[PDB]
Every structure is written in C-alpha cells, then in structure tokens.
Design a protein around this ligand. Structure first.
Ligand SMILES: c1cc2cnc3sccc3c2cn1
Length: 251
C-alpha cells in the first residue's frame, strides 16, 4: 500500500486514527504520521477552520518542541495530506493501560503540557477542549496534537471548565490541565464518580459541591490541583504562575 505527498512516495504500515491517520515510511525508510482529510462534503466555515489550524500548527512549530512536527502538506479541493511526526501512543490510551503512574514522569509530563499550552496562549490561541487524547508521547516527551481551531475522547465533559458550561480565556485551559493532572494523581477526573451527564454538569458549576483533594505525599502537587480547580476564572492560577510553582521548579 502506497501514497504520494508533494512528489514524495510514502508506504503505509498501519492505520492509527472524514479523517484517517496512518503510520508511514518514506523513500529514505524514515517513520512518519500521515493525516488524510476528505474535503468532499465540507463547507467553507469547515475549510477555513482547517486552513486556520494548519497555518497555526505550521507557525507554532518554530516556537516549541512540545508542539507536534508538521514536515509537509498537500492541499486540494478534494483532500488534505499532512506529513507529521509519529508518536508512540496518545496520553489517554497510555494512562488507560497503566495502573500506577510514576511521580517523576507525571512531573515531567506536566512541565511539557504547560510549555505547549503556554505557546498557543502567546499566539492568542485558547484551546478550550483539552483532554489527555490531545497529547502525544514521543520519546518520553509530551506533545500537543492540535489547537482546537479545526471543526470536530470526544464529547467528554470531565475536563470542561465552569465558564464553558454557563455559556473563555486562557484560564479555561488551566482548569482542563488541572483535571488531566488530577487523573495522573488520583486515578480519576474530579467529577468521574457521577455517571448522569446533567448531574455532572450541575456539580462542576455548583460551588457548594466540594471537590475532594485526598492527602498525598506530594504537598506541592496537591496545591497545584487546588489552584487549577477553582470555579472562578478570576481566582484561578495562570500558566506563567504555574511555570514558577514549587511543584515544577523544586528538586
Ligand atoms: C496525528 C499524528 C499522530 C502521530 N502519532 C500518533 S501515535 C497515536 C496517535 C498519533 C497521531 C495522531 N494524529
């Protein structure tokens, strides 16, 4: 099985993920990821969302290694081919498969998530739909897969900020990152216990609904969670503030 992106031939190895993602090999026998997108039944608002996300991904590549590498692309009126770097596994399936997560790898992953989200924020981008499925493990390093600009773990309200439920600033991405770190800390998201979707949304917003923060041996890690998971965006810690917190800095 084969395919041609900008005159270069790529051999398919396996499918990873309208859109199909594949693991491929080039002529020089190097491993890549090819995202295929079918534009056939797509509107102008959809096309603009797609061209906007590609342009942001192409630009933000130069600013951080914690953003997925985009090597090349081919765009027509019928399709998109994106030659990207191949990750090992996404953060979600890595966590789902793992029972207990190492405190050193968790601190390391946190640092990477802050670096990536901070970059998009410096360029005016608020992701708003952050989940572990949005991050990629590549050579013991987390990488942000996308920016939330392009149309369409999906649907999930577990990482949703209170401000998003009511209706959006960088503080929204802070709430979501805090939910991801909470999962890597406690083994569940803060509201995971609630099956009923409405009853879950009714708890995320309600301030009288106290989020449990059980006593862990990492006092700094407990403080981060308590700082991220504050219902009032005004009272929530910022990304530049998180990057200076003792949890990220102290050895
Ligand atoms: C674009 C590029 C990717 C590269 N590597 C991997 S490994 C598991 C998912 C993915 C992936 C998804 N979208």
């Amino acid at each position: 099985q084969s395919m041609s992106v900008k005159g270069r031939i790529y051999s398919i190895l396996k499918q990873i993920g309208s859109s199909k993602v594949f693991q491929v090999l080039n002529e020089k026998k190097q491993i890549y990821a090819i995202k295929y997108v079918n534009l056939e039944e797509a509107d102008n608002q959809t096309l603009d969302s797609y061209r906007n996300e590609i342009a942001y991904l192409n630009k933000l590549q130069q600013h951080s290694d914690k953003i997925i590498r985009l090597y090349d692309y081919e765009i027509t009126d019928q399709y998109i081919y994106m030659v990207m770097e191949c990750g090992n596994i996404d953060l979600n399936s890595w966590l789902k498969k793992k029972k207990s997560i190492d405190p050193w790898e968790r601190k390391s992953y946190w640092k990477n998530m802050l670096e990536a989200v901070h970059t998009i924020h410096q360029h005016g981008i608020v992701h708003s739909d952050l989940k572990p499925a949005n991050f990629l493990i590549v050579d013991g390093m987390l990488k942000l897969i996308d920016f939330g600009i392009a149309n369409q773990q999906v649907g999930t309200v577990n990482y949703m900020p209170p401000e998003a439920i009511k209706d959006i600033s960088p503080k929204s991405d802070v709430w979501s990152l805090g939910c991801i770190l909470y999962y890597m800390t406690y083994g569940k998201t803060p509201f995971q216990q609630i099956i009923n979707q409405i009853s879950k949304l009714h708890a995320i917003i309600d301030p009288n609904h106290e989020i449990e923060f059980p006593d862990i041996p990492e006092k700094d890690l407990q403080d981060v969670l308590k700082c991220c998971l504050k219902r009032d965006p005004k009272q929530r810690i910022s990304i530049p503030e998180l990057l200076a917190h003792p949890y990220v800095q102290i050895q």
